[PDB]
């Protein structure tokens, strides 16, 4: 028997741009999409649960390809600074004061509540105290990628690059065989990681078959300083070190010349486009249309809540579409169908799981969300693809499933206690202002 | 006796950047802010109504300085086109088919429901069938500026420029002595209005003491074509015609050289910055920091729902702050306090009513909104100014007052029927797709 049959007014499949099924239903078995049928054929089938969603659009869950989830606890603490000043003089000192297992667990949980509330099903995270992020991920039920940050300087978490690596690998070993939990290696950035450390990461990632998650080409200063310090721009350096390959998720990728776009395409890396953070830190505009035209998977992330300051993937996807048009002065850059692809299927491609999630397709896992379009904000309900990108908001997501399992139903969180999340945030407000 | 005393956790006054009152209350009498006192002193005072808003921020209502409200009915019908193509081949033909009194009334009402829901208290509108916009404005209770559009070409509404003017003035005469309703003259744009029509508008606006509301310098094509057709860029032409003065609200103002920034400052015009529409139509980035540094009142508008596609002033204000930083590559451009000023006090300045609304100040009219910050999206609650701009969403506005009168309470609309609005939208969906 089917576990669930969910019928909706619209289904955006993301299998082909523009494809929207009307009055169809999704049958779910063993956590996967087992059938996609006219809703009329669905009552004749048996199911453990049945759900009718009139005036709702069903679509793949949104994939946040770049977050620092625990930074939810620092929301609004460090505005109006460019990247290096922001890290050096505000973020790193605050992180030195407050970041331990407790912070990371509490902050990750808070972030996950906010993400589920806005229709995010997968988070590609990157932080410290990775066992705490993993624990939070198993608790929330989100599809979770835990990025083990690697730096050269000592922190409360680890004393040197080898220690970040050893601790990440030790923590990874405590969460083996978890279908929805995946550890990655996350060397922080070209300007905080040495050639030797990058080589160790390449070797380890290859041996253990892990993704590499790294902030790359975020600022002009990073790129220009790299030439001075390493003799070439960061991408060329990383190519020399062996880092560019399909396992690499390159966050930001704001400052690129045309040769670097082709380099990315040839090595089959993916990028995470984080428009709010790129604007807020005054980093610049990633040439996402050029990357996508070259065949590169460009997903979308939010970055952390201290440089956004939302974890809202619908808002982030709209912003990607708007910024692409203003940056190219071409109104046909990133149409709504492409933006949805960025927020879903391209994220899955980046994470090496596009055969598993990212579209509404029989055989794929049921990572799905439903948006209630019967609100003034999305009225009249003409084209749901257009509305999802340009009009709908995080507040309209009504239901969230990961592998067929409900994480939210009629905006009630089913795996996390929303009151508990608010209380942890209030605790941290007191502790940080202390 | 006070009509209302509203106590809140935070009050953002907008009287000085950064000023936030904690645990204070606003006493309202005769539609105006009569006192701002510590909340402890408030129970000792008598009031017809008392309201406690723990974890809420109270602030001035948001002022949408540029809308085409009835276009709510066209939401998502015309994406991925640049301005002239969009108007010529999509918008104007659709407007020729569907726009009459009924469309404008229904569409304005729908827009007003969405605007109130997101904390907008004043709308500077610009459309056709102005008596219908006026009627909708009196119904909703919003502070409403009705912009009587003037074009040269015949439409269902009017046959020539003189007819747009005569009809607007006739309709204005039916709504005299309304405190919350103000008619303006709205010549459409430099490229749709002749020198003779502009002169008639200058003369009429002076005689009747009316504001002038006009789309100016929206695109590079407009500015370059003006030189060919009129011998000078549009602002210089309008200066020659007498249009630049404090009564002018110049919408868009995207393509400006430094001489035009100073011209604007010298004539004391204001601009409406409409970032989503400027990005979506691929028009460009208005140099709002330069204008503001020169002393020009720069407010924020949404434009119409077919080029946004939201009427969300919180989202529009965040976008203004983000776009300013990425466009100048200066993270200190448009800090959150300045963005709030743009969305409130600068709108009031533009509309010539900054002595009346736009800040929380004794003697001013009680155009106020309350946002519930006790949500995951704005947790932890550190600085409410930062959160309002970078984290809070339209869904968190709980209460709206215009002149002390509640237009929304705990997200229930008090002057409009939300079900009726949804039904009109559904009616129009059917009629437009027919
Ligand atoms: O946009 C960013 N660029 C570079 N570093 C960042 C950004 N956001 C957060 N972090 C920092 O990266 C570390 C986790 O890998 C943390 O120190 C976090 O504060
Ligand atoms: O555009 C794509 N379509 C399908 N799969 C893709 C695409 N790009 C990368 N992959 C990757 O190919 C493998 C088999 O599906 C998976 O690793 C998937 O992520
Ligand atoms: O961003 C814009 N620029 C120019 N015209 C516009 C824009 N948005 C809507 N209209 C058009 O202006 C008229 C009302 O004055 C309407 O025809 C409307 O469709
Ligand atoms: O920065 C300002 N502060 C106060 N009033 C202003 C400002 N700019 C323009 N006005 C205008 O001056 C008159 C008296 O207050 C009003 O017309 C108001 O809108
Ligand atoms: Cl080195
Ligand atoms: Cl002329």
Kindly give the pairing relationship between strand A248-252 and strand A270-273.
parallel
Q: From residue A178, give the alpha-carbon distance in Å to each of A173, A175, A182, A353, B24.
A: 11, 6, 7, 15, 51
Task: Look up residue B22 and give its two tokens.
Answer: 């904690």
Question: Could you give the strand order of the β-sheet that contains A397-402, starting from the edge strand earlier in sequence?
Answer: A32-38, A20-29, A4-12, A50-60, A368-372, A397-402, A405-409, A412-413
**Among the listed residues B386, B367, B316, the one whose alpha carbon sits nearest the alpha carbon of residue B61:** B367
> CA B189, CA B151: separation in Å to the nearest integer?
8
> CA B170, CA A244: separation in Å to the nearest integer?
69
Determine if ligand 2 sits within 6 Å of the CB of residue A268.
no
Number of A to B CB contacts under 8 A, please give it: 198
Contacts with A331 from chain B: Cβ below 8 Å:
80-82, 86, 280-282
**Among the listed residues A374, A316, A306, the one whose alpha carbon sits nearest the alpha carbon of residue A340:** A316
Nearest to A76 among B80, B376, B387 (CB): B387
Q: Is residue B337 helix, strand or coil?
A: helix
* Distance of CA A130 from the midpoint of ligand 5 (Å): 26
Q: From residue A169, give the alpha-carbon distance in Å to each of A173, A175, A186, B52, B258.
A: 6, 10, 12, 51, 57
Interface test with A, best of B326, B372, B434 (most A CBs within 10 A): B326
Give Cβ neighbours of residue B187 (< 8 Å, ≥ 6 apart). Answer: B149, B150, B193, B197, B198, B201, B212, B214
**Are A393 and B310 within 8 A, CB to CB?**
yes
Q: Is residue B326 helix, strand or coil?
A: helix
> CA A279, CA A259: separation in Å to the nearest integer?
24
**Residue B397 in contact with residue B119, Cβ under 8 Å?**
yes
**Are A395 and B391 within 8 A, CB to CB?**
no
**Are A330 and B110 within 8 A, CB to CB?**
no
**Residue B106 host element (H or E):** helix B101-117
The residue to mutate among B297, B348, B349, having the most atoms of ligand 4 within 8 angstroms of its beta carbon, is B349
Q: From residue B256, give the alpha-carbon distance in Å to each of B219, B269, B285.
A: 10, 14, 10
**Residue B92 in contact with residue B74, Cβ under 8 Å?**
no
Which DSSP category does B179 fall into? T
Nearest to A279 among B326, B425, B432 (CB): B326
Measured from the Cα of A349, ligand 2's closest atom is 19
**Among the listed residues A1, A11, A2, A14, the one whose alpha carbon sits nearest the alpha carbon of residue A53:** A11
> CA B161, CA B148: separation in Å to the nearest integer?
11
Q: From residue A293, give the alpha-carbon distance in Å to each of A8, A16, A301, A342, A385.
A: 33, 17, 20, 13, 21
Q: From residue A252, give the alpha-carbon distance in Å to each of A240, A260, A298, B253, B354.
A: 20, 14, 10, 31, 42
Count of residues making up chain B: 434
Measured from the Cα of B354, ligand 4's closest atom is 19
Contacts with A87 from chain B: Cβ below 8 Å:
none
Which DSSP category does B395 fall into? G
Give Cβ neighbours of residue B228 (< 8 Å, ≥ 6 apart). Answer: none
Beta bridge partners of A299: A272
**Among the listed residues B320, B318, B317, B309, the one whose alpha carbon sits nearest the alpha carbon of residue B277:** B309
Q: From residue A312, give the alpha-carbon distance in Å to each of A116, A274, A392, B390.
A: 10, 11, 12, 11
Q: What angle do CA A422, A275, A132 make, to 5 degrees?
A: 40
Nearest to B331 among A281, A328, A383 (CB): A281
> CA B72, CA A420: separation in Å to the nearest integer?
39
**Among the listed residues B145, B143, B176, B184, the one whose alpha carbon sits nearest the alpha carbon of residue B31:** B143
> CA A314, CA B84: separation in Å to the nearest integer?
29
> CA A16, CA A18: separation in Å to the nearest integer?
6
**Closest chain B residue to the Cα of A432, Cα to Cα:** B382
**Among the listed residues B384, B320, B433, the one whose alpha carbon sits nearest the alpha carbon of residue B58:** B384
> CA B264, CA B256: separation in Å to the nearest integer?
10
**Residue B295 host element (H or E):** none
> CA B412, CA B396: separation in Å to the nearest integer?
13
Task: Look up residue B387 and give its two tokens.
Answer: 């959160």
Residue with tokens 């790299």: A226
Q: How many CA atoms lie within 13 A of B315 on its CB side?
A: 29
> Which ligand ends up closest to the CA of A346?
2
How many other C-beta atoms lie within 10 A of the C-beta of residue B174?
Answer: 12
Task: Look up residue B240 and give its two tokens.
Answer: 């020659």
Q: Is residue A213 a known part of a binding site?
A: no
Q: Whose CA is nearest to atom 5 of ligand 2?
A: A354
Residue A375's φ and ψ, nearest 5 degrees, are -140, 160
Q: Is residue B300 helix, strand or coil?
A: strand
> CA B183, CA B124: separation in Å to the nearest integer?
10
**Are B76 and A284 within 8 A, CB to CB?**
no
**Among the listed residues A239, A292, A298, the one whose alpha carbon sits nearest the alpha carbon of residue A270:** A298
Q: Is residue B42 helix, strand or coil?
A: coil
> CA A403, CA A382: separation in Å to the nearest integer?
30
Q: From residue B151, give the alpha-carbon distance in Å to each of A224, A256, B74, B387, B402.
A: 52, 45, 21, 42, 32
Interface test with B, best of A76, A224, A383, A398 (most B CBs within 10 A): A76
Q: How many CA atoms lie within 13 A of B27 on its CB side?
A: 18
What is the SS3 assignment for chain A?
Answer: CECEEEEEEEEECCCCCCCEEEEEEEEEECCEEEEEEEHHHCCCCCECCEEEEEEEEEEECEEEEEECHHHHHHCCCCCCCCHHHHHHHHHHHHHHHHCCHHHHHHHHHHHHHHHHHCCEEEEEECECCHHHHHHHHHHHCCEEEEEEEECCCCCCCCCCHHHHHHHHHHHHHHHCCCCCEEEEEEECCHHHCCHHHHHHHHHHHHHHCCCEEEEECCCHHHHHHHHHHHCCCHHHHHHHHCCCCCCEEEEECCCCCHHHHHHHHHHCCEEEECHHHHHHCCCCCCCHHHHHHCCCEEEECCCCHHHCCCCCHHHHHHHHHHHHHHHHCCCCCCCHHHHHHHHCHHHHHHCCCCCCCCCCCCCCECCEEEEECCCHHHCCCCCHHHHHHHCCCHHHEEEEEECCEEEEECCEECCCCHHHHHHHHHHHHHHHHC
Determine if ligand 4 sits within 6 Å of the CB of residue B355.
yes
**Are B379 and A332 within 8 A, CB to CB?**
no
Longest pairwise C-alpha distance within chain B:
69
How many other C-beta atoms lie within 10 A of the C-beta of residue B417?
Answer: 12
- Contacts made by residues B430-433, CB under 8 angstroms, sequence distance 24+: B431/B98, B432/A380, B432/A382, B432/B73, B432/B74, B432/B77, B432/B94, B432/B98, B433/A382
Helices and strands (DSSP H and E) totals, chain B: 16, 16
> Which ligand ends up closest to the CA of B274?
3
**Residue B299 in contact with residue B271, Cβ under 8 Å?**
yes
> CA B292, CA B350: separation in Å to the nearest integer?
13
> Which ligand ends up closest to the CA of B276?
3
**Residue B276 in contact with residue B282, Cβ under 8 Å?**
no
Chain B nearest C-alpha distance from A411 (Å): 13
**Are A378 and B332 within 8 A, CB to CB?**
no
> CA B395, CA B106: separation in Å to the nearest integer?
23
**Residue A26 in contact with residue A57, Cβ under 8 Å?**
no
Measured from the Cα of A355, ligand 2's closest atom is 15
Measured from the Cα of B353, ligand 4's closest atom is 19
Q: Whose CA is nearest to atom 17 of ligand 2?
A: A352
> CA B27, CA B4: separation in Å to the nearest integer?
6
**Are B110 and A379 within 8 A, CB to CB?**
yes
Q: Is the peptide bond before B309 cis (omega within 30 degrees of 0)?
A: yes
Q: Is the peptide bond before A243 cis (omega within 30 degrees of 0)?
A: no
Residue with tokens 């963005």: B339
**Are B379 and A75 within 8 A, CB to CB?**
yes
**Residue B28 host element (H or E):** strand B20-29
Centroid of chain to Cα A430: 29
String of b and e for B281-311 (b: at least 16 CB within 10 Å)? bbbbbbbbbbbbebebbbbbbbbbbbbbbbb
Contacts with B333 from chain A: Cβ below 8 Å:
282
Determine if ligand 2 sits within 6 Å of the CB of residue A74.
no
Determine if ligand 2 sits within 6 Å of the CB of residue A295.
no
The residue to mutate among A247, A355, A361, having the most atoms of ligand 2 within 8 angstroms of its beta carbon, is A355
Residue with tokens 């407010």: B299
**Among the listed residues B99, B130, B71, B54, the one whose alpha carbon sits nearest the alpha carbon of residue B311:** B71
Give Cβ neighbours of residue A315 (< 8 Å, ≥ 6 apart). Answer: A276, A393, A394, B315
How many angstroms separate the first and last alpha carbons of chain A?
55
- Cβ burial of A262 (10 Å; 0-12, 13-18, 19+) is middle
**Are A331 and B81 within 8 A, CB to CB?**
yes
Region at B55 (left for phi over 0; alpha for psi -120 to 50; beta for the rest)? left
Residue A186's φ and ψ, nearest 5 degrees, are -125, 70
Q: What angle do CA B390, B391, B392 make, to 5 degrees?
A: 115
Give Cβ neighbours of residue A333 (< 8 Å, ≥ 6 apart). Answer: A289, A324, A325, A327, B282
Residue with tokens 């237009």: B407
Nearest to A310 among B333, B377, B433 (CB): B377
> CA A190, CA A214: separation in Å to the nearest integer?
8
> CA B130, CA B197: separation in Å to the nearest integer?
19
Domains parsed from chain A with CATH numbers = 1-60+364-434 (2.30.40.10), 61-351 (3.20.20.140)
> Which ligand ends up closest to the CA of A195?
5
């Amino acid at each position: 028997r089917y576990e669930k049959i969910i019928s909706a007014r619209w289904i955006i499949t993301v299998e082909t741009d523009g494809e929207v099924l009307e009055n169809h239903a999704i049958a779910i078995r063993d956590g996967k999409i087992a059938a996609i049928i006219p809703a009329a054929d669905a009552a004749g089938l048996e199911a453990d649960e049945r759900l009718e969603l009139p005036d709702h659009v069903l679509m793949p869950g949104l994939i946040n390809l770049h977050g620092h989830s625990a930074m939810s606890l620092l929301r609004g603490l460090a505005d109006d600074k460019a990247l290096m000043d922001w890290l050096t003089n505000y973020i790193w000192p605050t992180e030195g004061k407050h970041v331990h297992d407790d912070f990371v667990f509490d902050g990750s949980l808070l972030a996950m509540g906010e993400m589920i509330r806005g229709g995010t099903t997968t988070i590609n995270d990157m932080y410290f105290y990775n066992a705490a992020v993993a624990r939070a991920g198993l608790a929330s039920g989100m599809r979770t990628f835990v990025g083990c940050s690697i730096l050269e300087f000592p922190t409360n978490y680890a004393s040197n690059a080898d220690d970040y690596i050893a601790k990440g690998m030790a923590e990874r070993s405590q969460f083996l065989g978890e279908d929805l939990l995946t550890f990655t290696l996350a060397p922080h950035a070209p300007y905080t990681v040495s050639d030797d450390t990058f080589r160790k990461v390449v070797t380890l990632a290859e041996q253990e078959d892990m993704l590499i998650h790294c902030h790359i080409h975020e600022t002009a200063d990073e790129v220009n300083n790299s030439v001075k310090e390493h003799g070439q721009r960061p991408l060329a350096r990383l190519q020399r070190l062996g880092l560019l390959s399909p396992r690499l998720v390159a966050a930001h990728m704001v400052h690129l010349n045309d040769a670097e776009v082709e380099l990315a395409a040839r090595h089959g890396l993916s990028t995470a486009h984080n428009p709010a953070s790129n604007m807020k830190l005054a980093s610049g505009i990633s040439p996402v249309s050029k990357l996508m035209d070259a065949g590169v998977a460009v997903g979308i992330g939010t970055d952390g809540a201290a440089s956004n300051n939302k974890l809202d993937m619908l808002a982030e996807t709209r912003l990607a579409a708007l910024l692409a048009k203003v940056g190219t002065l071409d109104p046909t850059s990133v149409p709504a169908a492409a933006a949805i692809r960025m927020a879903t299927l391209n994220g899955a491609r980046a994470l090496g799981i596009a055969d598993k999630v990212g579209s509404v397709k029989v055989g794929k896992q049921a990572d799905l969300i439903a948006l209630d379009l019967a609100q003034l904000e999305t009225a009249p309900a003409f084209d749901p693809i257009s509305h999802v990108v340009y009009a709908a908001g995080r507040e309209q997501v009504s239901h969230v499933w990961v592998k067929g399992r409900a994480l939210m139903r009629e905006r009630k969180l089913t795996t996390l206690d929303e009151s508990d999340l608010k209380a942890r945030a209030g605790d941290w407000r007191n502790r940080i202002l202390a």
